[PDB]
Symmetry: C2
Subunit: 246 residues, 2 copies
């Protein structure tokens, strides 16, 4: 009588939808401009889609983490490369967010375009004070075209614009909407701290397995698969990303 | 700068507090009466705690699935047709798709307790429920009670321990998210019976159900506040047995 149903949408699919949204904001902001060297600061797992996509508009792309012609470097290899004069990027994209890359390190560079990701979502006094986005933009006001990447959920609460944050809130809200469907007993959001699995337990197998999980597991009296999927889709479509020029 | 905090309360702790609430409701209903030969229907895992605690006011104690004796519905029925079991106390925790009234009609207890699976109103869940057709064959040749469990001024589709666990932890994660300096709050939940009965992975089951209820990304140390949110949501759960 009581059925158990997994959604066909996985967590990685939600994550990809958001990554694609942020990337298209970036691609819209760049117009059709081509670069020789792109440097993207951020964690590999959230930045890889943008790196892979920007590689078609660049001769070389670096992904720098603070951990195919795309190179992956932690921040110290990159600093050694810079001091040696082996890197000088015309495009810089900072996706680090809260407690991320330092303004004085950025001030050393001279790109044609700088894009910084604003981590702030709905207002939070502590998150507001910890944010230093505009101190990161300050050193470029006479060096480059500066844009601030913003991502919000339309008329919803999200404390940050982070892909993980948005993923969590999207899937949790969807499980609560699904719960309210006729005949549904409950809806489990299948989520985990993925960065913890990959970067602090170094278990690629477990990471790939938990992130490939069905987004929602539903205990229900009715086949609500299609409705659950469209609910999940509606919440994904609530996410809006754009780059504001300074 | 950005901290990651696991709550000290794990999912099993939530599960045990709900199971405990339901049990205290049941013994409040039994008012210290003692029995010998008790049968408890339900899925073992939700059905346990009640069995071992009822073992102190009883004896032989049976836990039947679809010290304490553990049974498949099959050994229990074969034992009954052969005439080796006749219980004075019956507690039915099977809920929505459980034991049929015609099979219950075969028994002759002094006391009967059935769990009402309905929570907040749902037309299909309401219709699928047949609690009172289960109470019908005893409706006073024996003392009959209905175990009801709700979240005060909150929505839950059933009174199931799994359901209440989920809704409690998810809601707690939403309140914790609203704290100043919190970036996000992950509710660590899993379909445990799927792991245990359908993948036969005791190690994976134990590992998953022992997970911290909530993993928090935050600027501030909010551990105590998170624990208190979680506790407040657990205390919203009210359980009682109504006498017919």
């Amino acid at each position: 009588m009581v059925k158990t149903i997994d959604t066909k949408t996985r967590v990685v699919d939600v994550t990809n939808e958001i990554a694609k949204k942020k990337y298209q904001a970036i691609r819209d902001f760049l117009e059709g401009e081509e670069f020789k060297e792109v440097v993207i600061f951020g964690v590999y797992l959230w930045g890889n889609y943008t790196a892979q996509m920007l590689s078609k508009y660049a001769d070389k792309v670096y992904l720098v983490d603070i951990h195919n012609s795309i190179k992956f470097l932690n921040l110290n290899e990159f600093k050694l490369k810079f001091i040696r004069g082996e890197v000088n990027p015309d495009l810089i994209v900072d996706l680090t967010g809260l407690g991320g890359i330092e303004p004085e390190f950025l001030a050393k560079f001279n790109p044609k375009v700088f894009i910084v990701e604003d981590p702030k979502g709905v207002f939070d006094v502590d998150i507001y004070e910890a944010d230093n986005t505009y101190k990161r933009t300050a050193p470029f006001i006479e060096k480059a075209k500066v844009g601030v990447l913003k991502t919000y959920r339309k008329a919803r609460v999200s404390k940050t614009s982070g892909t993980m944050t948005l993923t969590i809130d999207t899937i949790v809200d969807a499980s609560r909407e699904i719960t309210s469907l006729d005949g549904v007993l409950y809806a489990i959001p299948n989520l985990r701290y993925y960065e913890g699995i990959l970067f602090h337990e170094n278990d690629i197998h477990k990471f790939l397995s938990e992130i490939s999980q069905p987004a929602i597991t539903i205990s229900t009296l009715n086949d609500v698969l299609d409705e659950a999927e469209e609910i999940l889709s509606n919440n994904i479509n609530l996410i809006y990303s754009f780059v504001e020029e300074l």
